[PDB]
């Protein structure tokens, strides 16, 4: 029979993989497109520096990573192990956002 890891094993493997690495986890080009899409609502024909886009992606990824850490803590607080939208809402509310 084909081999199949039980649920949660590959999840932990993936956690160990990604907490050990430094690379950016969002694809660069779609994030750049999103940045430009949001930017045009404030001023048309905006130029951008590549390093500005990289810094934006760095800040966004760090913010989301910390937010997911707090979300995971909020989930484990309720004795669950699956994160739900209410977990993110609680994390944002307590964090002061």
């Amino acid at each position: 029979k084909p081999h199949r890891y039980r649920p949660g094993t590959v999840a932990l493997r993936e956690i160990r993989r990604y907490q050990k690495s430094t690379e950016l986890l969002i694809r660069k080009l779609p994030f750049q497109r999103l940045v430009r899409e949001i930017a045009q609502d404030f001023k048309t024909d905006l130029r951008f520096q590549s390093s500005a886009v990289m810094a934006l992606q760095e800040a966004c990824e760090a913010y989301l990573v910390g937010l997911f850490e707090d979300t995971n803590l909020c989930a484990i607080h309720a004795k669950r192990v699956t994160i739900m939208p209410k977990d993110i809402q609680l994390a944002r509310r307590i964090r002061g956002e």
Binding site: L12, I15, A62, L73
Partner: protein
């Protein structure tokens, strides 16, 4: 005649630039006047903190079998030390990642 010039970094025994610190203090509009010992004190403190962080980062790099400090090692040094982590709590390090940490309940039975 004028004697041999000696940088105030040499007088204080420091490695950081006392003159640059003094000029930045004057140009920064912190106050109208700047004392003579203030740049020396500030340069000494900056040198000390830099030496602390570099020592911990070098230890981390040696642990990872790397002879060059990279942002990952700076992150490891900063977050593994309680005092530095409390100093740089709000700072984000580019290309830093996070410390390896899995909650206990998520582990298999």
């Amino acid at each position: 005649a004028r004697a041999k010039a000696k940088t105030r970094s040499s007088r204080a025994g420091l490695q950081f630039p006392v003159g640059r610190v003094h000029r930045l203090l004057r140009k920064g509009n912190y106050s109208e006047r700047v004392g003579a010992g203030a740049p020396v004190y500030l340069a000494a403190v900056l040198e000390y903190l830099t030496a602390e962080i570099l020592e911990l980062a070098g230890n981390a790099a040696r642990d990872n079998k790397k002879t060059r400090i990279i942002p990952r090692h700076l992150q490891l040094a900063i977050r593994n030390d309680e005092e530095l982590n409390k100093l740089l709590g709000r700072v984000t390090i580019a290309q830093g990642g996070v410390l390896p940490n899995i909650q206990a309940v998520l582990l298999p039975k």
